């Protein structure tokens, strides 16, 4: 009876959560109007992990949709699975963050946060045993990068025991995206280091590469990107949602994947993954699933994992499979890619098995990876931060809405310490 409460913040967070509540309603048989059109009792056995019981046979998602603008909130309300949300946890502003961390954190983003904490407090005290919090947002935006981290800080202050995972969309390595992109990413990750328990870094160009090459889609589509991210989250929380041979919830994943407290930046994966015209042509065996999982070009955070070692690997398999093949496959990949794993931690693989695959597929498998290769992300972000910090560009907005050079340097030194400790644990030997 553990409970996870979802906290879509920003345009990116709202659009991602609108697909997340599509996938975990079609995995539970919940129609857009809110009833239960299911067949198995396993769907209704553990529906309280995400859905509060309403009057009649209705089920209401436990999600607080937060934005400083009404546009994407209206889009979520008008789209599919938009009438399933309660019309009270639609907290929205009338000004907008303007893609500014200062405007999200020390401006009217800090004015609506009182009502946001009131709604979160109500939806968290209307439970029996809260597992924790699930925040979806983007690092290079406004209220997702700003007010979202402020909400993280307030909740971490209020409940410093429960799990709090953040499916953060990381800005791309190429193109340009936002112009205050690395300022916002810097000031968000500085508060992500000491306030969250585990962070899933998701990269739009990695998703584009997967969509164009593996799925062979001519149009990449944000809906498809959010579908991939949503399937990743469903594969993360399927151990709480459904039974299995070897359960492993979010806290077990955090324990088995976080050696040191400031090392919780993960690289997610989900690799039952083929082009739509070649689905019936390809077998779905356990070794082939493992082969697609342990691939650098299937990764969803860029940051090529061959350029570094894996600290820990977690793998959650949804299907009716054999533990012998699963164990021998992880033993085989560990023995083969022995140089890509840290030697000071033996058996860097956590195995979870949930015997309920998602609808349609017959055996899925999702991938979480904590590795030293994520240090290239923060190295790049610090590179643009110091590049436009030595020129004093676009800092006038941050000083206008409140915050300034010293905590800018605090954030920059925080990422430098993070990069240095990642490099230290990459290059550290046994004896």
């Amino acid at each position: 009876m553990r409970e996870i409460v979802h906290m879509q913040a920003g345009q990116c967070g709202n659009q991602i959560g609108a697909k997340f509540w599509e996938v975990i309603s079609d995995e539970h048989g919940i129609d857009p109007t809110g009833t239960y059109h299911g067949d198995s009792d396993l769907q209704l056995e553990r529906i309280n992990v995400y859905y509060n019981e309403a009057t009649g046979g209705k089920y209401v998602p436990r999600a607080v949709l937060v934005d400083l603008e009404p546009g994407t909130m209206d889009s979520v309300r008008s789209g599919p699975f938009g009438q399933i949300f309660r019309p009270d946890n639609f907290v929205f502003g009338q000004s907008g963050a303007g893609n500014n961390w200062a405007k999200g954190h020390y401006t009217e983003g800090a004015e609506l946060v009182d009502s946001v904490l009131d709604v979160v407090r109500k939806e968290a005290e209307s439970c029996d045993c809260l597992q924790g919090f699930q925040l979806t947002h983007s690092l290079g935006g406004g209220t997702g990068s700003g007010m979202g981290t402020l909400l993280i800080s307030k909740i971490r202050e209020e409940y410093p025991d429960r799990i709090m995972n953040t499916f953060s969309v990381v800005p791309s390595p190429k193109v340009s995206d936002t112009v205050v992109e690395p300022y916002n990413a810097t000031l968000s990750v500085h508060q992500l280091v000491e306030n969250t328990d585990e962070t899933y870094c998701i990269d739009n160009e990695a998703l584009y590469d997967i969509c164009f090459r593996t799925l062979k889609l001519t149009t990449p589509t944000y809906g498809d990107l959010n579908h991939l991210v949503s399937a990743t989250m469903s594969g993360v929380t399927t151990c709480l949602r459904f039974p299995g041979q070897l359960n492993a919830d979010l806290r077990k994943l955090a324990v088995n994947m976080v050696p040191f407290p400031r090392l919780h930046f993960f690289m997610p994966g989900f690799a039952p993954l083929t082009s739509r015209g070649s689905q019936q042509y390809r077998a779905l065996t356990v070794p082939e699933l493992t082969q697609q999982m342990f691939d650098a070009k299937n990764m969803m955070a860029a940051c090529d994992p061959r350029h570094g070692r894996y600290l820990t690997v977690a793998a959650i398999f949804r299907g009716r499979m054999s533990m012998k093949e699963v164990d021998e496959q992880m033993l085989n990949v560990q023995n083969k890619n022995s140089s890509y794993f840290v030697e000071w931690i033996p058996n860097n693989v956590k195995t979870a098995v949930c015997d309920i695959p998602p609808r349609g597929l017959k055996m899925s498998a999702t991938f979480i990876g904590n590795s030293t290769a994520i240090q290239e992300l923060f190295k790049r972000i610090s590179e643009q931060f110091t590049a436009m910090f030595r020129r004093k560009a676009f800092l006038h907005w941050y000083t206008g809405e409140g915050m300034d050079e010293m905590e800018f340097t605090e954030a920059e030194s925080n990422m430098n310490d993070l990069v240095s400790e990642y490099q230290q644990y990459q290059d550290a030997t046994a004896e």
């Binding site: 910090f389 050079e405 010293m406 340097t409 605090e410 920059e412 030194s413 430098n416 310490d417 240095s420 400790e421 230290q424």
Partner: peptide, 14 residues
């Protein structure tokens, strides 16, 4: 700001 960055860093480098 470089001297302050090297002053407040836990693991300073370069």
């Amino acid at each position: 700001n470089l001297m302050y960055l090297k002053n407040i860093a836990k693991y300073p480098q370069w």
